[PDB]
Each structure stands twice: as structure tokens, then as C-alpha cells.
Amino acid sequence: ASPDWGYDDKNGPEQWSKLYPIANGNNQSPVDIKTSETKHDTSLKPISVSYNPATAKEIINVGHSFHVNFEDNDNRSVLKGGPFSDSYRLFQFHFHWGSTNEHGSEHTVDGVKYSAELHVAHWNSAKYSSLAEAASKADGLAVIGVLMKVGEANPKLQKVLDALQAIKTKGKRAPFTNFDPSTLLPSSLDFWTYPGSLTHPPLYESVTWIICKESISVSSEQLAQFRSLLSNVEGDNAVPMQHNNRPTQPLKGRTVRASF
Ligand SMILES: CC(=O)/N=c1\sc(S(N)(=O)=O)nn1C
Numbered sequence: 218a219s220p221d222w223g224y225d226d227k228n229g230p231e232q233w234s235k236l237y238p239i240a241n242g243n244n245q246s247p248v249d250i251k252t253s254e255t256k257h258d259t260s261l262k263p264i265s266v267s268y269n270p271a272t273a274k275e276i277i278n279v280g281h282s283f284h285v286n287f288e289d290n291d292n293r294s295v296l297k298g299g300p301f302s303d304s305y306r307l308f309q310f311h312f313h314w315g316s317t318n319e320h321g322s323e324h325t326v327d328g329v330k331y332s333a334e335l336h337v338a339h340w341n342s343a344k345y346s347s348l349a350e351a352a353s354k355a356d357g358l359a360v361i362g363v364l365m366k367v368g369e370a371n372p373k374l375q376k377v378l379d380a381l382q383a384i385k386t387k388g389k390r391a392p393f394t395n396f397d398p399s400t401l402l403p404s405s406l407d408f409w410t411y412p413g414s415l416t417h418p419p420l421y422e423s424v425t426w427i428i429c430k431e432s433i434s435v436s437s438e439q440l441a442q443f444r445s446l447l448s449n450v451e452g453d454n455a456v457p458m459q460h461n462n463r464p465t466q467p468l469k470g471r472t473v474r475a476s477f
């Protein structure tokens with residue numbers, strides 16, 4: 218239980234349950250969003266993101282992916298509105314991609330898989346005292362997912378792509394400062410929401426998902442750069458981060474609410 222899970226045949230998503238029984242839970246993520254079955258909730262408020270760029274701290278290779286971490290000792294960068302009554306503190310953003318540029322997202326819409334997906338995660342600092350605590354509670358986290366569709370290159374990604382040079386292998390880290398992740402969100406913030414979980418181990422069912430209706434672009438060459446990062450530690454044989462997406466999971470009676 219100290220660790221070893223992956224995205225390969227051997228320790229991949231279809232095997233995770235032998236180690237983490239919650240993989241077969243009732244609130245697993247991601248899911249397929251059937252637009253004809255969502256329900257308009259008039260109580261939903263517009264989402265309000267207020268991030269401080271000086272809160273950007275570092276970028277690190279974690280082997281299965283890379284994370285962009287933020288200082289979360291204060292409420293300098295918060296997520297408000299939507300379905301929530303309390304403020305959520307920003308802590309990180311990361312991406313998910315596939316082995317092909319066409320299909321790599323986690324969530325799907327009407328049975329359609331996007332190229333990639335951006336996740337902006339927050340934790341309930343109004344209720345818990347640390348991310349470690351919140352991480353396992355039902356109302357513990359809030360993640361904004363933004364679907365990515367291959368086409369024209371997205372210049373808003375450049376600073377992230379540039380930083381990838383310094384964290385080529387697992388365990389490498391570098392300072393990553395003065396950046397506001399809201400610059401990556403689509404122009405409209407109409408969304409879908411549903412209760413779910415972390416999409417990789419530990420798979421806790423502690424996330425309130427916010428999926429933006431509108432997608433963002435990325436070219437195939439930008440994606441190729443994600444796919445060029447290595448999962449091995451410095452000095453060993455090269456093993457590229459080919460994919461890190463989980464298949465969609467049974468909805469099991471949950472409701473996907475729409476803000477429109
Ligand atoms: C604590 C935490 O943020 N964990 C993560 S965030 C995450 S995700 N992909 O955003 O659902 N998956 N996991 C394992």
C-alpha cells in the first residue's frame with residue numbers, strides 16, 4: 218500500500234481495485250456527461266476565481282505526471298460561487314493526456330473523448346486545517362476540469378511548456394513563480410457539476426467536480442511535449458509519460474447539474 222500503481226497493463230486502472238477497493242465505489246470519477254440527462258439547478262451561482270500570481274511556487278515531476286504547486290497557507294488565491302457556500306483555497310494545477318493526440322481526456326461528453334484535460338484543484342480551508350485532512354472528506358476538495366481539443370496552438374500554455382526543460386525526470390523540481398492559472402480558463406464559465414472522486418490512487422471520494430462547458434485548444438506539438446517527460450529517475454533508461462488518463466466510471470444514480 219506503499220505505493221506502486223501506474224497506467225500500464227500491470228498496475229493500470231483495471232487493476233487498481235486489487236489494491237484500492239474504493240476503485241469500485243459509488244462515487245468514482247471520471248464519468249461520461251450525458252447532456253440530455255443533466256439537470257438545470259437555478260440555485261447554482263456563477264463561479265468566481267480570485268488567484269494571486271505571487272502564490273505560484275514550484276513545478277515538479279511526480280513520475281506519472283507533473284504538478285504546478287502553489288503556497289496554500291493563506292486565502293490569497295480562492296475559488297468561490299458555483300455550488301459552494303465556503304471558499305476553496307488553490308493548491309495546484311496539472312494535466313491528463315493520452316498516447317494519441319485525439320483521445321486523452323478523463324471526462325467525456327455525450328460519449329466523446331477530448332484530447333486532454335486540465336485540472337485546477339482546491340481544498341476546503343473553511344472546514345479543515347490542512348489538505349492532508351480535507352483530502353479524504355466528501356466536501357474536502359473542488360476541482361475545475363477544462364477539456365482540451367487538438368487544433369491551433371495555445372500560446373497561454375508556453376510558460377508551462379518552457380518550465381518542462383528543468384524537470385525532465387522523476388523527482389526534479391524548479392521554482393515556478395508569478396503566474397495566474399485563471400489565464401488558462403475559457404472565456405465563459407458556464408459549467409456542469411457532480412460529486413465524485415480523485416481520478417488516481419488514493420481515489421478518495423472527496424471531490425466536488427466543476428466541468429466547464431467550453432473547451433480550450435492545444436496543438437499536437439504542445440501535447441507531444443507533455444508526452445516527452447520521463448517517468449524514470451535521472452541516469453536510468455528512458456521511459457516516457459505516455460498517458461495518465463483513467464476510463465470513465467459508472468454514474469450509479471448520481472446527478473450532473475448544469476448552471477444553464
Ligand atoms: C490530494 C489530491 O489532490 N490528489 C489528487 S488530485 C487528483 S485529480 N486528478 O485532480 O482528481 N487526483 N489525486 C490523486
Ligand SMILES: [Zn+2]
Nearest residue numbers: 311313336416
Ligand atoms: Zn487530475
